Amino acid sequence: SMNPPPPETSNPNKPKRQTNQLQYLLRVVLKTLWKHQFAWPFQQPVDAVKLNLPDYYKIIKTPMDMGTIKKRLENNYYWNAQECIQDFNTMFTNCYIYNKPGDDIVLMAEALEKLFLQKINELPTEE
Amino acid sequence: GAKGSKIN
């Protein structure tokens, strides 16, 4: 297929918020994953046209990527940390749904996800 | 796999 429109990164009708944990999510969690040597395939939406993956968006109906997450955090799009955490989890789950064990992208996701989970274990106080 | 080789 053609690619779908990307996930929105702002919405003028969605209440915005800053919280301690959202600040951590941007400045510690996303920052650390973004600079990782294996971040690059996850820094923007999957381009199924460029990668020649005709079935990607037939299989994956809730796409997510760290570029979208970064922009959402920068825009104060999320109301709470759980929304953000869910987007990271969606990103990883999609990778594991679509790709096979031992594919490079799966090895990369695994390494990023382990780092993610350690940082989430370390989430600060809500206030 | 589907996405090919990515690790240097």
Author numbering:
A (entry chain A): 42 to 168
B (entry chain C): 773 to 780
Recite the paper's sentences.
Bromo and extra-terminal (BET) proteins provide a recruitment platform initiated by the recognition of acetylated lysines (Kac) by their tandem bromodomains (BRD, Dhalluin et al., 1999, Jacobson et al., 2000, Owen et al., 2000). BETs, like all of the 42 human BRD-containing proteins, contain additional interaction domains that recruit other proteins to the acetylated protein target, forming complex assemblies and contributing to processes such as chromatin remodeling and transcription. Direct targeting of BET-BRDs by small-molecule inhibitors such as the high-affinity and pan-BET specificity thienodiazepine (+)-JQ1 (hereafter referred to as JQ1) enables their displacement from Kac. Multiple decreased interactors harbor sequences that can directly associate with BET-BRDs in canonical or new BRD-mediated structural binding modes, and we propose that the tandem BRDs present in each BET protein may be capable of simultaneously recruiting both a histone and a second interactor.
Based on our earlier work defining the flexible G at the X1 position as a binding preference for histone H4 (Filippakopoulos et al., 2012), we fixed this residue to screen a subset (91) of all 2521 unique K-GX-K motifs found in the human proteome, focusing on nuclear proteins with Kac sites annotated in the PhosphoSitePlus database. Additional peptides carrying a Kac-GX-Kac motif, including those from GATA1, ATRX, POLR2A, and TOP2A, adopted the same histone H4-like structural association with BRD4/BD1. Our structural analysis identified multiple cases of non-histone proteins binding to BRD4 BRDs through histone-like motifs in the same structural template we initially described for H4. Our data therefore suggest that Kac-XX-Kac motifs beyond those found in histones can be recognized by BET BRDs.
